[PDB]
Design an enzyme around this catalytic site. Structure first.
Site, mmCIF file in Angstrom:
data_model
loop_
_atom_site.group_PDB
_atom_site.id
_atom_site.type_symbol
_atom_site.label_atom_id
_atom_site.label_comp_id
_atom_site.label_asym_id
_atom_site.label_seq_id
_atom_site.Cartn_x
_atom_site.Cartn_y
_atom_site.Cartn_z
ATOM 1 N N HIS A 45 -58.463 87.969 8.939
ATOM 2 C CA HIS A 45 -58.522 87.290 7.641
ATOM 3 C C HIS A 45 -59.792 86.449 7.401
ATOM 4 O O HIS A 45 -60.072 86.107 6.247
ATOM 5 C CB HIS A 45 -57.270 86.396 7.428
ATOM 6 N N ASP A 93 -53.673 90.486 12.817
ATOM 7 C CA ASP A 93 -54.765 89.619 12.401
ATOM 8 C C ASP A 93 -55.778 89.414 13.525
ATOM 9 O O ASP A 93 -55.772 88.396 14.237
ATOM 10 C CB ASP A 93 -54.182 88.292 11.942
ATOM 11 N N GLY A 186 -59.743 76.431 9.162
ATOM 12 C CA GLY A 186 -61.068 76.380 9.780
ATOM 13 C C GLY A 186 -60.957 76.596 11.282
ATOM 14 O O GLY A 186 -61.983 76.758 11.936
#
Ligand SMILES: CC(C)c1ccc(NC(=O)[C@@H]2CCCN2C(=O)[C@H](CCCC[NH3+])NC(=O)C(F)(F)F)cc1
Ligand SMILES: [Ca+2]
Length: 240
Positions: A45, A93, A186
């Site tokens: 992602h 992912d 983040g």
């Protein structure tokens, strides 16, 4: 990382910062793990947007010269064939980035140790999350690399109703959930480091948190289980 503490410069030498070009500058967007001198593992992602990306190894303070950084361009991105942006809860992912050059290893830049295929950690195993992500829900990025003690929550508890229920799959590792410490935006793509046989190995790639907030009681941070992808990782390295 919410509820973390600052890490020493040399504690987690496989941690990288994935940055994209923003105007004339570079902005941190995600963590990652150096797994070969010219390959990085991160979350798929993180590279969904078609941006110009670079990797920084040997990084400690995002906003000041540490004297240990090496900066290298991303030459090829290979995300997992089954990744679907519209469903991070389906899994897969994970992405691998081939670097434009081989980085030099030293005490600030080392390869991450990957688990053996199929390895599942027992509940409450000692692990650390590291990253430069938000230090509060809707806060700001850390300047310095943060770490937090995040013990695993096994699949049976994490997929129960009170926790993530059906959203978590067996291809994922859950860690934390105490309402105090967690990964946050983040930190995605970065490592969950777990001590197995006297050695820290990277068992998770940070994937998601609750949309209600980063440190939410009974919503542990969820990671892609690296040991479910060992064959894929090796097949991509050996052919690119
Ligand atoms: C139900 C399932 C599909 C699902 C579960 C949790 C979320 N989480 C979110 O929406 C929260 C808030 C914004 C960023 N975010 C996230 O969890 C994103 C990744 C999700 C990508 C979604 N396409 N990751 C992170 O913030 C983290 F912590 F890993 F660094 C989104 C979807
Ligand atoms: Ca720096």
């Amino acid at each position: 990382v919410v509820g973390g503490t600052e890490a020493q410069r040399n504690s987690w030498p496989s941690q990288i910062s994935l940055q994209y070009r923003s105007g004339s500058s570079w902005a941190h967007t995600c963590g990652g793990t150096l797994i070969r001198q010219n390959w990085v593992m991160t979350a798929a992602h993180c590279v969904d947007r078609e941006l110009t990306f670079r990797v920084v190894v040997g990084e400690h303070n995002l906003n000041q010269n540490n004297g240990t950084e090496q900066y290298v361009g991303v030459q090829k991105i290979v995300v997992h064939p089954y990744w679907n942006t519209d469903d991070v809860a389906a899994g897969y992912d994970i992405a691998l980035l081939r670097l434009a050059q081989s980085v030099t290893l030293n005490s600030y830049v080392q390869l991450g140790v990957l688990p053996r295929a199929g390895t599942i950690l027992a509940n409450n195993s000692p692990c650390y999350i590291t990253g430069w992500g938000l230090t509060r829900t809707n806060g700001q990025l850390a300047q310095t690399l943060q770490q937090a003690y995040l013990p695993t929550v096994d699949y049976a508890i994490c997929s129960s109703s009170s926790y993530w229920g059906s959203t978590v799959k067996n291809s994922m590792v859950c860690a934390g959930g105490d309402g105090v410490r967690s990964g946050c935006q983040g930190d995605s793509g970065g490592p969950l480091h777990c001590l197995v046989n006297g050695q820290y190995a990277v068992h998770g790639v940070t994937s998601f948190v609750s949309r209600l907030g980063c440190n939410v009681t009974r919503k542990p941070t969820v990671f892609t289980r690296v040991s479910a992808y060992i064959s894929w990782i090796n097949n991509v390295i050996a052919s690119n």
